[PDB]
């Protein structure tokens, strides 16, 4: 069975690509990562840094979460990543994404031991 420490790598880590991506990326990277099987998923982010790199993120900036928990976490650094957003004009199954690379903070959720990235929440 999945994690929530895998599920978050499976959803949110490409860290084979430096930054990129053509603007076919999403596209194929949405469904190679299993997030166009049961809906297209509307708005999701990959994260072009080592796993190490992301994983350290859980002891830097404690920030509030968007659902008002206390356990979320603002990278100091910026960080490659790489938003895909569904387009107007997306049809399940065929889910058509815009891919936009972007260097931005990112805020992810930890939970655990060891204390991991268990959601991405927001970049700044």
């Avoid at 992301?54 to 979320?72: D, E, I, L, M, Y």
Wanted: glycine share 2%; net charge positive; charged share 20%.
């Amino acid at each position: 069975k999945e994690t929530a420490a895998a599920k978050f790598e499976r959803q949110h880590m490409d860290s084979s690509t430096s930054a990129a991506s053509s603007s076919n990326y999403c596209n194929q990277m949405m469904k190679s990562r299993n997030l166009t099987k049961d809906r297209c998923k509307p708005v999701n982010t990959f994260v072009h840094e080592s796993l190490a790199d992301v994983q350290a993120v859980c002891s830097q900036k404690n920030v509030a979460c968007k659902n008002g928990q206390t356990n979320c976490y603002q990278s100091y650094s910026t960080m490659s990543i790489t938003d895909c957003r569904e387009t107007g004009s997306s049809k399940y199954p065929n889910c058509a994404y815009k891919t936009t690379q972007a260097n931005k903070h990112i805020i992810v959720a930890c939970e655990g031991n060891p204390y991991v990235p268990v959601h991405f929440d927001a970049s700044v």
